[PDB]
Amino acid sequence: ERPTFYRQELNKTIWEVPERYQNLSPVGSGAYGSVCAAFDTKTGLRVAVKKLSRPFQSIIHAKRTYRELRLLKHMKHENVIGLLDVFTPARSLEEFNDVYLVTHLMGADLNNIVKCQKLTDDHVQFLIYQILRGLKYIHSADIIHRDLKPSNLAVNEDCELKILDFGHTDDEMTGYVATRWYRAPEIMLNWMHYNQTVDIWSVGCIMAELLTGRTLFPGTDHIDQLKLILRLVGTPGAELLKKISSESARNYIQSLTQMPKMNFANVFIGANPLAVDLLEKMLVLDSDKRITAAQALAHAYFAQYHDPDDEPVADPYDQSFESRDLLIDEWKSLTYDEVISFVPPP
């Protein structure tokens, strides 16, 4: 049955939401999108409500809207942001033009927690364990995050973690920016068609930063960052070179003076030797040889948290729509169907 909706001006747009959602207050100051905190009187939950901006203005935007709804509707895991609710004030497909997404309100993002500070090894174990647990779930559905970084890792005061934004312009990847610091080199420099292990590179970067309080590869640009990466992990061998399908990228790589891999125990002084070992297995230049999420969970570093029976995989995720070319109204109808058919979690 259709709830009663009420109207309110918030982020210079009119939010129209069910009565159950009270005390809407904008959060993140633009960083999370058009997002409000609210109290869900039906569940007693503090929630985050995201209103999608002009979701069907173009083919690209319409498909992107469908993509996000599909992704969020699929994710049902403790360490992954899922959907508590999705709604539209529209009574039919013809008046459908706004999409509102509801999830748990989290306390902070990881960036605001690390705050130039070393975390205790125990805190690192727990946070990384949860990230890896969430990624095992995400990867098992053949979904890649592609953009893991502290700012899309949300945490409560109990240190319980959820991953946001799973599934950027040139200007915002330019220069001394956190938007690029956690990216695998193969994706940063378009070496090849990339796979799930790009996310593992990001975890390695995050893990190191939690351990030292410092960005692992704070490159001032793409080239500076590559040099920082290669100084640590060594220049690519012949084997990886072959796999760089971009002739241009491969040619540039070979112009660099060869460097051996550094000793991680000398790089991460004082760190748990098990943490060093895992970092070594995550920060492998050849993505084929990086540890997977499922493998990392079984690493001795997570002994006090690892439970093979409590690390679920995902239902199959049909993403055949990604290779599909459709019109705006067709993407819009597909999205509408997904909104209408939503069933809230117990």
Contact set with ligand FKN (CB under 6 A): 27-28, 32, 35, 37, 48, 50, 72, 81, 83, 101-109, 154, 164
Q: Is 32 within any annotated ligand binding site?
A: yes
- Least CB distance from residue 95 to ligand FKN, whole Å? 22
Residue 255 CB, shortest distance to ligand FKN, in Å, is 41
State the nearest-atom distance from the C-beta of 345 to ligand FKN, in Å: 12
The reply to whether 307 belongs to the active site is no
**Nearest approach, Cβ of residue 60 and ligand FKN (Å):** 20
> What φ, ψ does residue 14 adopt, rounded to 5°?
-90, 110
We find the least distance from the C-beta atom of residue 283 to ligand FKN, in angstroms, to be: 26
Give the strands of the sheet with 35-40, arranged side by side: 21-26, 35-40, 45-51, 100-104, 85-87
Question: Is position 86 annotated in a ligand binding site?
Answer: no
Phi-psi region of 44 (alpha: psi -120 to 50; beta: other; left: phi over 0): left
Nearer to ligand FKN, 107 or 218 (CB): 107
Q: Does 33 appear as a known binding residue? A: yes
Q: What is the DSSP letter of 77?
A: B
- The answer to whether the CB of 275 falls within 8 A of the CB of 266 is no
How far apart (Å, rounded) are the C-alpha atoms in residues 228 and 337?
Answer: 48
Asked if residue 35 belongs to a known ligand binding site, the reply is yes
Q: Which of 165, 170, 224, 288 is catalytic?
A: 165
SS3 assignment, position 180: helix
How far is residue 102's CA from residue 118's CA, in Å, rounded to a whole number? Answer: 33
* 270 assigned to a ligand binding site: no
| Pairing outcome for strands 153-155 and 21-26 | unpaired
3-state secondary structure (DSSP) of residue 153: strand
175 marked as part of a ligand binding site: no
Q: Are strands 161-163 and 153-155 parallel, antiparallel or unpaired?
A: antiparallel
User: What is the spatial distance between Cα 4 and Cα 283, in angstroms, rounded to a whole number?
Assistant: 52
How far apart are alpha carbons 192 and 170 in whole angstroms?
18
Among residues 217, 215, 248, 245, the alpha carbon closest in space to that of 233 is found at 217
271 annotated as a binding-site residue: no
52-81 in b/e form (b: 16+ CB < 10 A) is beebbeeeebbbbbbbbbbbbbbbebebbb
Q: Which residues pair with 18 in a beta bridge?
A: 5
Annotated binding site for ATP: 27-35, 50
Catalogue the active-site residues. 165
Annotated binding site: 27-35, 50
